[PDB]
């Protein structure tokens, strides 16, 4: 068993290898189109002495942080061990080999979506977003008085082919990312596969509809067997005005009993209604997971609340560095020290802490952040609190 | 139809009433100790001409607020309409009648629990916690390196009747509620209802047992049906120590499958383990719902977060007064003003930030809170927020 | 209603009634593949007067039974009566035509698989052997310390597309089919049938993976609806190693939680893992159906016991012939006798002796086989057991 | 943490954990009955410094083994760990010291019932008989022509309350324990348990009703939740009569859909039906396991089949010691030896021989008992088996 970037002749014994280990995996023309998003030296494959047992890459991304500052980042995936090599170390060996070439190619941070949630802690991703399911009864949903769009003439939303306003979707959810921590820019081949799942399937999905309004839209299909439930698809929404008069016409939604969204725990739907309870949380779940690469480079890099007074400390990251933290002003200066630590803490759950998603306060409870000094949990709970909520582009 | 404070004659007409409106009433003599709450004149019938098809009361309840600051509490229960006397208007006339004497009698707040979402926001009553179930599949639950007493020697957890440590379970309680938003002392009748709800029923609920430490307890009982299922009734710890010490008692139930408790969303749990996915939210309501009787009162009595800088402010609540608001050094001063608001909102929505459950930011994107300053959103999201997370103490 | 061999115009007629009468039809093309494995005169069709109301044929197969003797079996298949003329005794004439051809066309024995286990006992059908299934909850299982193949090293099992190993399943499947009584010889339409149903069928079942070591091979694909199982279609091995070899693989699919697999009551999964109780036994039928057309033929052919000592005794087959049998040294001779017969059973009995699947104590138990003597019982139970144990080759 | 005999003070504390411990635990005084069966020095504790964290016992019990023997035998029973407790090596060193009075004490084997199957294979136990759940759907049923008792006249069962006819069953089941493998002695106090247990529990199980035959009897009731189901607690028969008696009139049920009953892999029902498949299994697991204490003290102790002919080996058992083997005229001879093993087995295979449930042949499949001569396979294979079926005598 050798590690190496693969050849040309490599791609499609790793096409079998996904037929076999993903489920959700459509074929080799889709999975060609995402391989352009995989630069030179991106991949790697094991194999066996004959065929592939073991590849990872990683893909080229953009992701947004707080104070709407874009991040290069290490997209990993179609990580992937033959049943045939279980507990070989081939996962261990393909993470190493990825890791190194990202560091020494600059990228700052790393991310992935786990398929477990108990085998990428170790190798430093925490989970760094938080996805909600909520299922509206939409036949009990009435709008409060207070919820915008509730005055007379015409709606400003209407009911189109996806296929027919590809152009207005990317532009507003081009706007979208450039504003949302999570966010992600979304490059041609990923707009082509999206629409491409837009039409129906012989026994399949069913066709896609897109409300579309001037600062959003939402993309559904009723669920192939229970034809009394809409699955949104994608929200994607710049403005409230936007959000609520998308929800206005999901509601309309006469036929259906049930409109169901993955969304994010701050999404507003729940006060828009009358009844809060009527947006059920059906299923929560992490999303993106990050590994902070280059700890200095990362914590520089996004902004922080301007509310919490400037404070300085010592964070100690296990096997990362120890580093002179100074916020002030929604800025951070980070610098190499020996000086005593103030806060310890795995890379993982300094990932976790990067986007928002999770209070330090709450990870201090569970003891997988050390400090002496509670005054100073406080500080960098209000520091790494982002005023955006933090939410999940895209799966990749 | 009258509306007046029930007689000794009306109780019996009452418990009727309340075993045909609730399906969880025990009956008389559990009926008559939640009685010994409720003060001279904290309780209204309406008789038809004759027998009673209206009731409300309130009890005398003792609210922690951020700050660790106590409130007297009027805690609105056991309301009810005859189903023979439905849209009469009886639940709004007898709601102004409490609101009146709760008022009269010099309580800040009011809160309830709601049997439906959609009732009690149009009388001022905003929901102010949030209940998450979590159910660990205990069967490949792992506990973290980094998560406490771990270390070798013995437990300091003993396997106990609930019925021979009341008053350790009392102590530790006590303390809980002091500490923590959502607190509510528990007098003695609702300790003797408790334990009485520990032992079995013959084709009921089974024996519960308790788990204590030092700074800690859980009781739980094995489901009636599901055989495989553990539900944690209630578990109280006041240290992180404590915390992680039941959850490591609760997942070396080995017999079960399934641990199910309602907790809160900050709950450290998931990240006490190896795979955080393992505790998944199977469920997620609103718990307590507050009135702000009183806003000047309310506004002043609870503590800010000392992070945010000194910053003044107009609230409008809407036909509830126009106030000028200064936050700082983690207090509060609130005086009448006709000074142009800078911020409106209904009473509802107050009551939903004062525990800090709720972000301004949230409710602003909903527009059930109007302001032109997103510095000032952002103001208000940083001085409301609590640093110990809000919990619900128990239903009522 | 006349009853005849078909002629070419009758199969289109013979096809419709198959569509409407079986479930697992595909049609034409692959029907008229199965079709040249049915001999000159192997076919009777009941016409009314006109359309085809009545079918049946045998096909030509290879049997292996105890001893590995390979004998000449007719395959009963493709029976249906029309849902218009039931209790017409359609199936009772065309059985006694098929039975009358089989045996003067010289096989010693006829074989089918039954839709309903009540129909043909009667027609001299015995369940001759036993379908489990078997599903492993994958996620804990581990192999015990003894199992084959847990050194260190390489896999020797390959991951590979069935359709590019052809060559190799037919070299293992006939190795095995040749040792296993139940073993079918499975000619080339078959193998291009099994091939075929291996590919993703749109809106149907999902792309078929094998795994291949050197003496054994299992085909599998991922359920349907539940994407968490894993259905294991067929697992061939000729040595214990090979058998080890693709379950260490198949407990290797860590996406799925189960696996589940139709194999037989004396595989040894079970016993392989530290817990034999994670391969539940989930469903178990009868497989093979037996009707020995010629008692002495049979009885002679294949091998018994050697353990048990020599022993004689008169065999009563009901309506079937009274006969001398001398068992020993693995060898029987079966002749004629008027000699008061020791042992009675009907002809449906005696096809579930024939392959070991049966104890001749149990069938006593029920009175399905009369002796005065239990000295005998035991020696018949002794001498027709098999040391391979019986198996089921694929349905027909 | 030290370990001992429990004194009369330890009692509550134990019947504590047996509450937490195992969810069938009735209460304290039919634990003080069962009690009556644990000998002086058969229980141990395991005190913290105070309260009971661990506790196990065996109880004297006589084991029918193949050939009608029966051997005093230690069932080991009501072993618990505190949920508190767990991960500190109680269990091995509960086991180790109760194994120590066992051997020292004289019995040959131990036996025990499994709460989970991958417990006590690490301690020397094997599964040594099987389980299977049948469902009869009864409005098919039709008895055989061949079956028993279906001659004219009268029914010699009869319907009876199981209160009235204590005497009658024991007689039956004292007759059934001796001839059966898996037989135990019933002592008075387990039938005070079990008529106890006849009677309907107010919100919990019906009336129990038995239907009578001079050789044989069944125990039944209706299920809790399924009015339309039959649940056989209890089937003893001595004769074959007996049993197809009581199986007619259990589908004489004419409210019943299903009869369910847990039996054996060899149970005749199936065959006294004109449709084998309509005793559906339903379920299937390991009943009681064994630990052969003394080796050659058990092996010499069973009878063998007088089929096979006198033959000799050397069998090592894994750290239990190396012993000549020589078996013919269906008794045994072991002696010590230190001449080369020809056959290697753990101490739990042996124990899943000892009663003829598994063949040596699977065994050695799974690599848990190696030989290098399969002649030698086979005749342990045929050695080892029982003429009469091995049955579940009553849980413990
Ligand atoms: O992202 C993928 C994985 N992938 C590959 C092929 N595919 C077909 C249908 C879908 C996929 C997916 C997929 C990904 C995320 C998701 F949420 C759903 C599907 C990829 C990356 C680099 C490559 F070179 C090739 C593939
Ligand atoms: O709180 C109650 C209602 N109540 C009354 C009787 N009950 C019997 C069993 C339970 C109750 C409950 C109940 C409350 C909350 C809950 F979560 C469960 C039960 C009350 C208040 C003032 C009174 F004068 C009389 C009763
Ligand atoms: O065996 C068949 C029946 N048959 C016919 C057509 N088919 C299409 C798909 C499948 C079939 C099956 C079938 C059989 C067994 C099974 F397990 C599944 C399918 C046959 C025999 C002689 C003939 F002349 C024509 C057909
Ligand atoms: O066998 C028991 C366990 N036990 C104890 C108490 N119990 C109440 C109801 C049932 C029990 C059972 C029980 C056992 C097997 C079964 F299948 C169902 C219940 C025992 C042995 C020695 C003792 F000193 C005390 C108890």
Chains 1, 2, 3, 4 share one sequence.
């Not at 941070?109 to 938080?130: C, D, K, M, Q, W």
């Not at 008085?145 to 979707?169: M, N």
């Not at 928002?356 to 400090?371: E, K, M, P, Q, V």
């Not at 509670?374 to 500080?379: V, Y």
Request: aromatic letters at 8%; charged letters at 25%; proline letters at 5%.
């Amino acid at each position: 068993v050798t590690l190496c970037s693969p050849t040309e002749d490599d791609w499609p014994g790793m096409f079998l290898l996904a037929a076999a280990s993903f489920t959700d995996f459509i074929g080799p023309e889709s999975a060609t189109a995402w391989r352009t998003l995989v630069p030179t030296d991106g991949a790697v494959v094991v194999r066996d002495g004959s065929e592939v047992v073991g590849m990872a890459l990683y893909m080229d991304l953009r992701l947004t942080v707080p104070g709407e500052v874009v991040l290069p980042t290490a997209g990993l995936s179609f990580v992937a061990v033959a049943p045939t090599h279980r507990r070989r170390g081939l996962l261990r060996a393909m993470c190493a080999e990825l890791h190194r070439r990202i560091a020494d190619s600059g990228y700052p941070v790393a991310a992935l979506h786990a398929s477990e949630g108990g085998i990428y802690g170790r190798f430093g991703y925490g989970p760094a977003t938080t996805l909600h399911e909520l299922t509206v009864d939409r036949r009990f949903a009435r709008f409060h008085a207070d919820a915008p769009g509730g005055g007379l003439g015409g709606s400003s939303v209407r009911l189109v082919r996806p296929t027919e306003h590809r152009g207005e979707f990317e532009a507003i959810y081009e706007r979208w990312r450039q504003q949302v921590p999570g966010g992600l820019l979304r490059p041609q081949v990923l707009w082509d596969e999206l629409l491409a799942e837009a039409k129906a399937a012989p026994g399949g999905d069913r066709e896609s509809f897109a409300l579309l309004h001037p600062d959003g839209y939402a993309l559904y299909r009723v669920d192939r067997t229970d034809l009394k439930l809409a699955r949104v698809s994608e929200l994607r929404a710049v403005t409230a005005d936007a959000h609520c008069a998308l929800w206005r016409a999901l509601i309309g939604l006469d036929s259906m009993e049930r409109i169901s969204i993955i969304t994010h725990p701050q999404d507003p739907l729940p006060h828009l209604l009358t009844d809060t309870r009527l947006a059920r949380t059906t299923w929560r779940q992490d999303g993106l997971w990050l590994r902070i690469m280059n700890v200095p480079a990362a914590l520089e890099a996004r902004g922080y609340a301007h509310e919490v007074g400037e404070f300085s400390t010592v964070l100690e990251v296990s096997d990362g560095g120890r580093f002179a933290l100074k916020i002030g002003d929604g800025r951070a200066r980070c610098t190499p020290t020996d000086a005593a630590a103030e806060i310890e803490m795995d890379r993982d759950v300094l990932g976790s802490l990067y986007l928002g998603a999770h209070r330090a306060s709450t990870l201090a409870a569970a003891n997988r952040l050390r400090t002496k000094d509670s005054q100073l949990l406080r500080r960098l709970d209000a520091a790494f609190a982002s005023d955006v909520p933090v939410q999940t582009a895209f799966e990749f």
